[PDB]
Amino acid sequence: QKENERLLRDWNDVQGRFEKCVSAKEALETDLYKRFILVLNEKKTKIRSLHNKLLNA
Amino acid sequence: MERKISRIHLVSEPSITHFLQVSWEKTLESGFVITLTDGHSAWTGTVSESEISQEADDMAMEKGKYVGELRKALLSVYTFNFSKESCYFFFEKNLKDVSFRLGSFNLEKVENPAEVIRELICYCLDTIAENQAKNEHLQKENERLLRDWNDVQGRFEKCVSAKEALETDLYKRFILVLNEKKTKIRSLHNKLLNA
Amino acid sequence: MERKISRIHLVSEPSITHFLQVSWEKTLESGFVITLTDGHSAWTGTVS
Amino acid sequence: YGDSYFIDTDLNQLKEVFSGIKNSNEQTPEEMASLIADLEYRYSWDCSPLSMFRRHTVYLDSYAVINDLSTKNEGTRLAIKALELRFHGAKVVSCLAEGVSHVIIGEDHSRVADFKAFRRTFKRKFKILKESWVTDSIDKCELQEENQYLI
Numbered sequence: 001q002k003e004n005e006r007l008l009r010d011w012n013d014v015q016g017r018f019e020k021c022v023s024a025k026e027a028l029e030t031d032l033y034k035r036f037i038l039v040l041n042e043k044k045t046k047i048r049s050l051h052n053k054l055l056n057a
Numbered sequence: 058m059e060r061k062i063s064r065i066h067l068v069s070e071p072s073i074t075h076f077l078q079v080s081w082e083k084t085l086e087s088g089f090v091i092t093l094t095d096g097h098s099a100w101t102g103t104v105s106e107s108e109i110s111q112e113a114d115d116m117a118m119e120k121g122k123y124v125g126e127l128r129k130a131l132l133s134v135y136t137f138n139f140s141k142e143s144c145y146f147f148f149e150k151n152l153k154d155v156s157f158r159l160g161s162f163n164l165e166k167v168e169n170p171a172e173v174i175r176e177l178i179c180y181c182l183d184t185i186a187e188n189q190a191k192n193e194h195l196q197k198e199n200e201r202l203l204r205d206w207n208d209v210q211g212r213f214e215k216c217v218s219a220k221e222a223l224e225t226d227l228y229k230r231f232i233l234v235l236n237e238k239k240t241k242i243r244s245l246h247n248k249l250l251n252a
Numbered sequence: 253m254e255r256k257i258s259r260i261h262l263v264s265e266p267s268i269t270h271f272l273q274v275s276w277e278k279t280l281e282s283g284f285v286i287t288l289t290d291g292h293s294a295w296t297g298t299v300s
Numbered sequence: 301y302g303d304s305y306f307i308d309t310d311l312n313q314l315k316e317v318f319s320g321i322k323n324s325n326e327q328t329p330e331e332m333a334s335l336i337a338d339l340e341y342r343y344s345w346d347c348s349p350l351s352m353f354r355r356h357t358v359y360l361d362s363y364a365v366i367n368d369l370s371t372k373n374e375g376t377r378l379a380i381k382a383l384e385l386r387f388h389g390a391k392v393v394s395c396l397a398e399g400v401s402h403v404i405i406g407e408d409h410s411r412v413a414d415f416k417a418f419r420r421t422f423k424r425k426f427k428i429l430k431e432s433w434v435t436d437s438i439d440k441c442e443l444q445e446e447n448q449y450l451i
Contacts, residue, residue: 004195007202014209014380017438021213021387024350025220032227033311035345036235041308043238048306050245057252171292175269178291182259182271210379217383220350228336229327230318234303241305 058082062177063133069140070095078177079131086110086124091162092173093139093146099173100144102164112160123159126150130159139164253277265290333391349441353390353434358402359426360385360392361411366418367395378406381434388438396426403428405451412451 060080067075073095081089088105113120129135134151147161167173255275262270268290276284283300303309303317327335337354340346346354362378364371381404385392393400396418403415403426415428433449 001195004199004202007199007206010377011202011206011209014206014213017380017384018209018213018216021216021220025216025223028220028223028350029227030311031348032231033314035343036231037309037311037314039343040234040238040303040314043235043242044303044305044308046242047238047245050242050249051305054245054249054252057249171268171290174291178257178271179259179269182257207375210383213380213383217387220387224336225325225329225332227318228332228339229324230321231339232335233321234301234314234317237301 059084060180061132062180063131065093065137067137067139069138076177077131077137078173085128085132091164093164094170094173094177096174097170098141099167099170100139100141100164101167102146102162104162116158118159126159135159141166330391347442349388349438351389352437352441352443353385353388356385356389356402357391357393357400358385358404359396359400361403361405361408361415363394366411366414369394373408376406378404378431381406381431384434384438398422398424400426402426404431404434405429406431 058080059082060078062076062078065075065077066073076094076096078092078094079085079089080092081087086106086109088107088109089103091102091104093100109124110120113123116123118126130148130150135148136151137146137148139146144164144166145161146164148159150157150159253275254277255273258272258274260270260272262268270288270290273287273289274280274284275286276282283298285298286296288295301317301321303314333354336351337346340348340351340354345351360378360382362373362376363369364373382392385404396403401424405412405415405428412428419425419428427446428451429446429449430451433444433446436449437444
């Protein structure tokens with residue numbers, strides 16, 4: 001009886017957590033690239049500018 | 058109707074086992090039927106609400122501790138004594154160098170040593186068998202629960218590993234692309250302060 | 253060692269539940285001890 | 301590498317570039333964890349749920365003997381808690397050196413006197429927390445206050 005109660009709880013538990021983790025994993029790759037795009041375009045703006053100024057001088 | 062059965066001794070016969078059997082309706086507190094046997098002979102008694110509650114009134118022991126001490130004593134120090142003629146049974150709570158009365162029954166025996174022993178054996182063999190059935194069912198059920206739990210473990214380990222690899226892989230590639238931009242910004246920033 | 257209690261009715265005795273007890277070393281085939289009882293009396297023997 | 305310095309670019313464009321970079325792992329896991337911890341600090345990604353334990357180094361008490369890697373207590377719910385801590389950015393470690401910020405305790409307290417005694421040695425001193433700290437922080441998507449979860 002004790003082992004049945006424990007595993008019925010614990011099964012519901014990892015079932016829910018796992019499916020939450022699968023969904024979060026599937027969002028993670030869009031998230032990181034959205035963050036990287038912006039940072040990397042701002043850096044490109046700084047490189048364009050400094051290299052243009054260096055060319056003119 | 059409920060019931061319990063238990064092995065005892067008597068100090069009157071120190072060398073040999075006996076069996077008490079205690080059977081009651083709903084609770085031990087409504088009153089009950091009690092039965093002693095050696096393995097050969099039928100002793101019985103009936104002792105009911107009006108006077109079980111009178112025990113914890115004749116005695117200094119209060120109801121909870123006495124019925125509790127009795128289910129410790131009876132339903133498995135205690136000490137048990139009976140004589141077959143008088144049919145007086147008694148038992149007492151033995152303590153470290155003091156000793157005091159717990160209970161006694163003036164029992165009255167019965168005619169059927171066999172029918173008594175038969176019902177005791179049949180109760181055991183049935184109660185045995187029903188529990189082995191339940192033990193199979195819960196065993197099957199909770200093999201399914203463990204079998205499943207272990208598989209979700211496995212998949213979760215795959216997901217955790219895939220998530221770690223996704224982070225370190227993406228960040229290593231970001232770091233390469235980012236750092237080259239930062240290095241060029243530095244080189245140009247310095248080169249531009251100078252020209 | 254194994255034993256096994258089993259509850260029976262003799263044809264002779266419709267209303268008495270009897271108990272057959274068998275006791276042996278995993279193969280019954282090796283021979284066994286056997287008891288019958290009715291809660292009043294008991295009987296025994298052996299097979300090889 | 302073919303991301304254009306002179307143009308600002310999209311998801312599909314950096315995806316392509318990333319798939320064209322070679323495969324390598326020369327960065328130590330410890331170097332890498334701090335590169336990530338620093339980038340998530342600079343750009344404020346550090347409260348992001350799947351990184352919430354990034355700044356936690358964690359020992360998991362399933363070893364019947366503290367620090368002896370032979371004594372693993374497998375098939376316990378502590379194994380799910382190490383999947384969970386790893387999934388949310390914790391540096392889960394199989395040996396308790398000076399580098400540890402947290403020890404996690406399950407049902408079996410038979411080791412807590414010895415964690416508490418060994419922690420008398422330490423210059424920077426780890427917390428000892430109940431399993432439920434990890435659980436409750438993940439469920440609320442946020443680091444829950446550790447003091448209610450002590451020992």
